[PDB]
From a paper:
In this study, we report on the detailed structural and biochemical characteristics of an esterase (EaEST) from a psychrophilic bacterium Exiguobacterium antarcticum B7. These studies provide insight into an unusual enzymatic feature, the dual catalytic role of EaEST as a typical esterase and perhydrolase. The results of analytical ultracentrifugation demonstrated that the purified EaEST protein is a stable trimer in solution.
The crystal structure of an esterase (EaEST) from Exiguobacterium antarcticum was determined in a P3 space group. The asymmetric unit of an EaEST crystal contains two protomers. During the process of structure determination, unknown electron-density maps were found near the active sites of both molecules in the asymmetric unit. After building and refining the model, additional electron density was clearly observed in the hydroxyl group of acetic acid, indicating that EaEST has perhydrolysis activity via acetic acid. The hydroxyl group of peracetic acid forms hydrogen bonds with the O atom of Ser96, the NE2 atom of His248, and main-chain oxygen atom of Trp30.
Author numbering:
A (entry chain A): 1 to 268
B (entry chain B): 1 to 269
The structure:
Amino acid sequence: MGTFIQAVDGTKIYVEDIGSGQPVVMLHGWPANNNMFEYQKNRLLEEGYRYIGVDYRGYGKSDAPATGYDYTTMASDINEVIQQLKLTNVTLLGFSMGGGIALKYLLNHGESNVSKLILAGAAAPVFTQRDGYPYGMTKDEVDALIEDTKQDRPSMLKGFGEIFFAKEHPEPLQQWFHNLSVDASSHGTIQSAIALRDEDLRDGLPKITVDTLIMHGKKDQVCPFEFAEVMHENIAGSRLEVFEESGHGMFLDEREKFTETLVSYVKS
Amino acid sequence: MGTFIQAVDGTKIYVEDIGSGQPVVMLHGWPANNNMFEYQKNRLLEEGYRYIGVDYRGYGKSDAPATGYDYTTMASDINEVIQQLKLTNVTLLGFSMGGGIALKYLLNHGESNVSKLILAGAAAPVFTQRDGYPYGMTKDEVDALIEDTKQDRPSMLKGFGEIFFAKEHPEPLQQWFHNLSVDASSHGTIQSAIALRDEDLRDGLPKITVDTLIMHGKKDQVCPFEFAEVMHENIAGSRLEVFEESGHGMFLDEREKFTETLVSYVKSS
């Protein structure tokens, strides 16, 4: 369900458009797809909001070009989605890499369509270590991760899964999650990892004016909690909500608090 | 600099890469080659800019494969030129079909390496008439050119030269220009005429963000001046300079004005 939207360069981008009312645009993490928000999606539809789930180029049911995995190109894709569908008063949720893409979209295309921003487990302002930012993976760790993905992607994914959740979810649940990532294009997966390693949004954060909720797991081993402290420090007017029991995947480790918090924010 | 760039399909693309300091990438019209810009190039070089004149596949000193004359593949070749020569801050000029390719390149590969766009007599947004675009050759007029190239290409060309310039230029100048086109591969010339006939960039014009200058001859019989009006309305912030005394070939009809407008814009947007 849901149409495909053409990107500026013609790539077909799959968008799931379901429910009634004010729009909630959810942007997935690396290297999954929009189905990761299934539980939130259900909860939106019964509270009377409209879920808009995009699969990035290279992921899920979208096309997978050889190019365009940098945040600029991805943010232009989001811009096209918002344009075709004529969305205003958007609650824009970016999860992990999606948080980076959401920030890039605001920076490059403006803030007037978005009434509020939610940054969840966001890979922002940087996924990797920088001067004055001694948190997260180093570029060299991301390169080792790229090496692994060129040797055995499924085993890389298994490993990533192991550090993604603080809690031990049932096997069928972990398997469903694993398979979102396995159906990603291998080359999209790789080029996005290159973008995660290199992208730096530190100069842009103090430029952000949208009302902002930051959701982040204290135990996050993928994007450390220190990222969330930096986002809150740098975005004026922002609120930090700490998920004390969660790792990166707060949408399962604390599914009810995550979705009640999302719902309460989209109302308020 | 030198020689040849590898396209995605391996086709070798000739590039005349000359000078140092800021790059001005010049994209020729159908069915000539980068040498048509010589009068402009002379001035860019004395003003201390770097001339990057691409010969498309099928033209000039480039390989002429069987396929890939569609603007998508051509725009991909331009991406290769810029990426492999590691250019940024480029002024990108497209003349005629070059105009169309320049736009497609911006749409398909983004604007991060390009500081400004010049569209000179451009074949855009469409070279042939459509639904609510009642300007230019019809599709059947371009089929007529294609048919003629399949029987007598130099005669086809002499005929095209006659509709190319508003003024009668000296016999040796016209012969020079003619011979630039006779050098073209016959089969590239045909395949690019098919892309001219069929390509349609109307949807894409409002996606262009880069600073644009439109240069166009009031008397152009090849790409009618109405194309320029359409481009100016739809490309954000574009400026329009009308060449009152020029046909399609402004680069000779108003040589001095064309060159010194181009130079000024390369100097500042």
